Design a protein around this ligand. Structure first.
Ligand SMILES: COc1ccnc2[nH]cc(-c3ccnc(N)n3)c12
Length: 340
C-alpha cells in the first residue's frame, strides 16, 4: 500500500522526526478522524508551528477535503473580524499521495476542557464568553454568500486558540455543506443532532444552533444534555426536557412514527424507563434557584438566579423544536444573557 507509507485504513503511517519537502518537521499525531489524521509540525520557512490534516489516500475523502478547502478559502476571502472564529487554512498540497491541509496551530478542544473540570463544568461567565464567540461564528456562516451549515458541532470540534485565553475557533468543515439541497441525511453527532434530522426532515443552518444550545448547557454542567444510546433514546431524552414536539412538525415528519403515535383526536404522544414528557425542566438541570448544577455555584459571583434565568431563556430559544422560529445568531447576540 503506497510504497509502505500507508496502513490498511489508507492513513499515512506518521513517523515522529520526519522532514517533508525540506520544509516541515513532523513532531507528533495530535488528532485522528474519518478524514485521516492531524499532526503538529514545524514550518522552517515561516518560522512557526502548524497543524497538518493528512487526508486518507482514498478518492471519497480526498473529494470531501477538496470541498473543505473550497469552503475554507471562501470564508478567508471575507473582510470581517468575524472570520477569526473559524480556523485559518494557510495552504494545501499533495504529499506521498495524501492531500495535506496546513492550518494555524490551535490548542485543546472544549471536551478536553470539561475533562480538566472532571466533568463538573466551567463557570457561567466562561460559558457566556464561549456562547458569544459561537453565535458570532454562526452569524458569519449564515452570511448569504457563505450559507455554510457546519453539521458536526460538538465540544471536540471547538478548540481554544491557546491554553491561557477564552478565545475559541471552529474546526473540521469536512461534514459541511452550503444551503441549497432541501434533502435529509443521517448527519450531526447523536448527542447534538436536531429534532428535524432525527425526524428525517430537510435541514438548514438552524441545526448548528440546536447543537450550540446542547453544547452550552454541557459546558456549564459538565455532562451532555441529551446523551442518547440511539435515535429513539435520543428523541425520548429530548422529550423529557422539552415535551412533545408541535403536531405541525410531526405531521410533516417522515420518521415521526418511529418515536410517536398519532391518537384518534389527531394529537401525538410517545410510542410504548423514561420520565414523562417535559418532566426534566432545564430550570432544575441548571439549578437556577438552587446554586447552579449540583448546587456547586451557591453564592459565587455571576451565578445569581436572574443570571440563570437569562441563560435558561437563551437555551430554550436555541432548543426550539421549530427550525423556522429557532433563534437566529444576531438575535441570540442581543439576548439579555450577554448584557453583562
Ligand atoms: C486536532 O485538530 C487540530 C489541533 C490543533 N490545531 C488545529 N488547527 C486546525 C485543526 C483542525 C483539525 C481538523 N480539521 C480542521 N479543519 N482543523 C487542529
Amino acid at each position: 500500500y503506497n510504497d509502505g507509507y500507508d496502513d490498511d485504513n489508507y492513513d499515512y503511517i506518521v513517523k515522529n522526526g520526519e522532514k517533508w519537502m525540506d520544509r516541515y518537521e513532523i513532531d507528533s499525531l495530535i488528532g485522528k478522524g474519518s478524514f485521516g489524521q492531524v499532526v503538529k509540525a514545524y514550518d522552517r520557512v515561516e518560522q512557526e508551528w502548524v497543524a497538518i490534516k493528512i487526508i486518507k489516500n482514498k478518492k471519497a475523502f480526498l473529494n470531501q477535503a477538496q470541498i473543505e478547502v473550497r469552503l475554507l478559502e471562501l470564508m478567508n476571502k471575507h473582510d470581517t473580524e468575524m472570520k477569526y472564529y473559524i480556523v485559518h487554512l494557510k495552504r494545501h498540497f499533495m504529499f506521498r499521495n495524501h492531500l495535506c491541509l496546513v492550518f494555524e496551530m490551535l490548542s485543546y478542544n472544549l471536551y478536553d476542557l470539561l475533562r480538566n473540570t472532571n466533568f463538573r463544568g466551567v463557570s457561567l461567565n466562561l460559558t457566556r464568553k464561549f456562547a458569544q464567540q459561537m453565535c458570532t461564528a454562526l452569524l458569519f456562516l449564515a452570511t448569504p454568500e457563505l450559507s455554510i451549515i457546519h453539521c458536526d458541532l460538538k465540544p471536540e470540534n471547538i478548540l481554544l486558540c491557546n491554553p491561557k485565553r477564552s478565545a475559541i475557533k471552529i474546526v473540521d468543515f469536512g461534514s459541511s455543506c452550503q444551503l441549497g439541497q432541501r434533502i435529509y441525511q443521517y448527519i450531526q453527532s447523536r448527542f447534538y443532532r436536531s429534532p428535524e434530522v432525527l425526524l428525517g426532515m430537510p435541514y438548514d443552518l438552524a441545526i448548528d444552533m440546536w447543537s450550540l444550545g446542547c453544547i452550552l448547557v454541557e459546558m456549564h454542567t459538565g455532562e451532555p444534555l441529551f446523551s442518547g444510546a440511539n435515535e429513539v433514546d435520543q428523541m425520548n431524552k429530548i422529550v423529557e426536557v422539552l415535551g412533545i414536539p408541535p403536531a405541525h412538525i410531526l405531521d410533516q415528519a417522515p420518521k415521526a412514527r418511529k418515536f410517536f403515535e398519532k391518537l384518534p383526536d389527531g394529537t401525538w404522544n410517545l410510542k410504548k424507563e423514561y420520565k414523562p414528557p417535559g418532566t426534566r425542566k432545564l430550570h432544575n438541570i441548571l439549578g437556577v434557584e438552587t446554586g447552579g448544577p449540583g448546587g456547586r455555584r451557591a453564592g459565587e459571583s455571576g451565578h445569581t438566579v436572574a443570571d440563570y434565568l437569562k441563560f435558561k431563556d437563551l437555551i430554550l430559544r436555541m432548543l426550539d423544536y421549530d427550525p423556522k422560529t429557532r433563534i437566529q445568531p444576531y438575535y441570540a447576540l442581543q439576548h439579555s444573557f450577554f448584557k453583562k
